[PDB]
């Protein structure tokens, strides 16, 4: 039994954690500095709450020509656009202005219920089709065909950050770790007890999965979870209205946390029936919780079940 060192801090409006076994204390001290520095840089790349972030500079710009961005920005957006297509638009990184219209952004509250005409007009300003990624040998770009398109990567940033943290671990010669950024995690190697890192999914008891060599993410709709007296604040990108189905939690295991974090949001928006079709077609490892009145129901794909201990 070797000691597991735990490092923790703040990033992206949430928290990160890194567990590492058998690492001495001057190393884990330095590693925290590097982790926080990297996560600060990722936050500065992606945040919609930082006014001079790379993403916000693009958002504020009125240009319809290619806008230079980093490799990570290009790849995050490519992944998001494609999983958006594969979830029939349900995962939409351009939906922000519809969310703001409702006042359902996390740093805002009171606004009138918008009219459908208002919603439909606002939809003209959103859509996965409006965004393009351009890759070349030493450069890459985003390009929007609408000046007032607004890109929000908050639904995939944790997954990216978690994958980027694993890259950092490798860089620093760390072979065994459990790293998390918000709801996204990557697992590799054995813990202090010589066993796979414990990753639990809540089943209303904890069901345990071994996701060694994989990543995981969960997305939910919680305004109903704890009662249904209220609406979801999850907006369907296609209707511009709150989702109406009973799916309250989706957990995805994938080779990368970014993929998991992209899928879980899309599947959540789709609801049980449509999500299951996507999960079947794409061969995804997914765990779903639905709330019927007062009762909770769960569903796991076969691919998810492979991860159960
Ligand atoms: Ca997500
Ligand atoms: Na549109």
Author numbering: 12 to 215, 222 to 244, 247 to 328
Sentences from the paper on this structure:
Therefore, we conducted extensive crystallization screening of Ftp_Ec wild‐type protein reconstituted in vitro with Mg2+ and FAD in an attempt to obtain a crystal structure of FAD and metal ions bound to the enzyme. There are four monomers in the asymmetric unit of each crystal structure, and the r.m.s.d. of the monomers within each structure ranges from 0.5 to 1.6 Å and 0.3 to 1.6 Å, respectively, between the two structures for approximately 300 Cα carbons. John Wiley & Sons, LtdIn the site previously denoted in the Ftp_Tp structure as metal binding site 1, a single metal ion is bound in the wild‐type and Ftp_EcE169K protein variant structures. Aided by the high resolution of our structural data, two water molecules were observed bound to each metal ion and thus the coordination number for the metal is seven, consistent with a Ca2+ rather than a Mg2+ ion as observed in the Ftp_Tp structures. Refinement of the metal in this site as a Mg2+ ion resulted in large positive peaks in a difference electron‐density map; these peaks disappeared when modeled as a Ca2+ ion. Thus, in agreement with the original structure determination, we have assigned these as Ca2+ ions. Superposition of three representative Ftp_Ec monomers illustrates the inherent flexibility of the loop region near the active site comprising residues 237–253. The Ftp_Ec structures suggest that in solution the cores of the Ftp enzymes remain stable, whereas a single flexible loop adopts different conformations during the catalytic cycle. Recombinant wild‐type Ftp_Ec was able to flavinylate RnfG_Ec in a Mg2+‐dependent manner in the presence of FAD (lane 4), suggesting that this type of posttranslational flavinylation reaction indeed is a protein‐dependent FMN transferase activity, rather than an autocatalytic one.
We recently reported a flavin‐trafficking protein (Ftp) in the syphilis spirochete Treponema pallidum (Ftp_Tp) as the first bacterial metal‐dependent FAD pyrophosphatase that hydrolyzes FAD into AMP and FMN in the periplasm. Orthologs of Ftp_Tp in other bacteria (formerly ApbE) appear to lack this hydrolytic activity; rather, they flavinylate the redox subunit, NqrC, via their metal‐dependent FMN transferase activity. In the current study, we identified a bimetal center in the crystal structure of Escherichia coli Ftp (Ftp_Ec) and show via mutagenesis that a single amino acid substitution converts it from an FAD‐binding protein to a Mg2+‐dependent FAD pyrophosphatase (Ftp_Tp‐like). A high‐resolution structure of the Ftp‐mediated flavinylated protein of Shewanella oneidensis NqrC identified an essential lysine in phosphoester‐threonyl‐FMN bond formation in the posttranslationally modified flavoproteins.
